[PDB]
């Protein structure tokens, strides 16, 4: 399902990041990097969900998870 993150979408992200030319190996590399990122964040968000004895991941769970990891997200509070 990582494959559902398409080469065109990855190209667009690099374009916003200012990138002009892109090696063919970048697309798989990027998929693994995103995967690691999402594993880490979702692992913690779910941990907050469970601690609260909820079965639904809330936006605030994700915000706490991102905070724990030195990333602060504005706009989803709270």
């Amino acid at each position: 399902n990582i494959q559902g993150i398409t080469k065109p979408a990855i190209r667009r992200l690099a374009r916003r990041g200012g990138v002009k030319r892109i090696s063919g190996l970048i697309y798989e590399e990027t998929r693994g990097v995103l995967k690691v990122f999402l594993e880490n964040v979702i692992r913690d968000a779910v941990t907050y969900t469970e601690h609260a004895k909820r079965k639904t991941v809330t936006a605030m769970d994700v915000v706490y998870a991102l905070k724990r990891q030195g990333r602060t997200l504005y706009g989803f509070g709270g």
């Binding site: 602060t72 997200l73 504005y74 706009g75 989803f76 509070g77 709270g78």
Partner: protein
């Protein structure tokens, strides 16, 4: 529960009387205000503790502002804070 929207809105009308703000943007300002509140209160909490004090006073808030804010933001902040405390105390 609560948010800072009406206060953010009042301050918007002060600096830009004719400018509005979208709902998503108001949400970013709410996170901003909450984030900074927490950074300062936490630093002020740590300051009182290190010094074996049980009270957070305006002096802890000030030092926390000096630790957290860069350069010129710190200077104006400390000014705004002292100014408000002085106006409050006489009133």
């Amino acid at each position: 529960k609560e948010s800072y929207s009406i206060y953010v809105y009042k301050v918007l009308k002060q600096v830009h009387p004719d400018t509005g703000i979208s709902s998503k943007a108001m949400g970013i300002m709410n996170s901003f205000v909450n984030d900074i509140f927490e950074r300062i209160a936490g630093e002020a909490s740590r300051l009182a503790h290190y010094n074996k004090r049980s009270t957070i006073t305006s002096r802890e808030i000030q030092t926390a502002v000096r630790l957290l804010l860069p350069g010129e933001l710190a200077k104006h902040a400390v000014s705004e804070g002292t100014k408000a405390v002085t106006k409050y105390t006489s009133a």
